[PDB]
Amino acid sequence: MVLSEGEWQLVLHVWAKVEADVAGHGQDILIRLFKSHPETLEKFDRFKHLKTEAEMKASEDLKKHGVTVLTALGAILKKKGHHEAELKPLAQSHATKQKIPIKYLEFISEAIIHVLHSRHPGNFGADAQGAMNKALELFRKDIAAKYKELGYQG
Ligand code: HEM
Numbered sequence: 001m002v003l004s005e006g007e008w009q010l011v012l013h014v015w016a017k018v019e020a021d022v023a024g025h026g027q028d029i030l031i032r033l034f035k036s037h038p039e040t041l042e043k044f045d046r047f048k049h050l051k052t053e054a055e056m057k058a059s060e061d062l063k064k065h066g067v068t069v070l071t072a073l074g075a076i077l078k079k080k081g082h083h084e085a086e087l088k089p090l091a092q093s094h095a096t097k098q099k100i101p102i103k104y105l106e107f108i109s110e111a112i113i114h115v116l117h118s119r120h121p122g123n124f125g126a127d128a129q130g131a132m133n134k135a136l137e138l139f140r141k142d143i144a145a146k147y148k149e150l151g152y153q154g
Contacts, residue, residue: 001137003080003135007131010128010131010132011128011131011135014120014124015074015078017123022066022067022071022074023063023067025066025119026063026067026068027062027063027066029066030056030066030069031056031057035053040104040107040108047061072086072090076139083142084142087139087142087146090143091146092146095152103154105139106140
């Protein structure tokens with residue numbers, strides 16, 4: 001798929017607001033994912049002992065991981081579709097080392113959209129949400145193709 005320039009602008013405008021607090025957004029998004037889809041927590045041997053939201057919020061390791069996730073995603077979105085080299089190592093680690101099905105990438109996409117709508121309602125109306133949803137669908141479609149090339153297809 002291809003996004004128009006106007007669509008990328010909507011995506012990068014709200015992302016610039018996210019980047020004012022990467023750690024905070026990273027925590028919010030992972031916690032949302034784990035709350036909504038507790039089965040995803042089982043993939044993380046470093047976090048699956050965490051029992052409550054309070055414990056998640058207090059976890060420094062969880063916060064650090066949130067920053068890593070959003071820094072990587074930000075680097076991909078800023079390529080505006082030209083992301084083939086960025087996606088190769090991400091695909092390999094999520095396919096071979098961790099085995100993360102595509103369904104779980106949909107779950108985190110939902111979590112990102114929820115947190116952006118909650119923190120940035122003025123910059124995340126219907127048109128901006130649509131554009132962010134297209135950008136994340138593009139990401140998932142390209143990662144799924146790489147999964148298949150790698151032998152997983154998740
Ligand atoms: C927007 C989607 C995602 C991005 C940008 C992302 C990015 C990353 C990055 C950059 C790392 C660290 C280095 C590496 O191993 O590649 C990582 C590790 C990992 N990711 Fe993801 N990830 C995404 C989604 C997910 C999902 C949906 C799950 C599981 C439900 C997941 C599970 C893991 C695990 C288990 C690790 C290793 C954690 C550890 O070091 O103990 N990832 N991810």
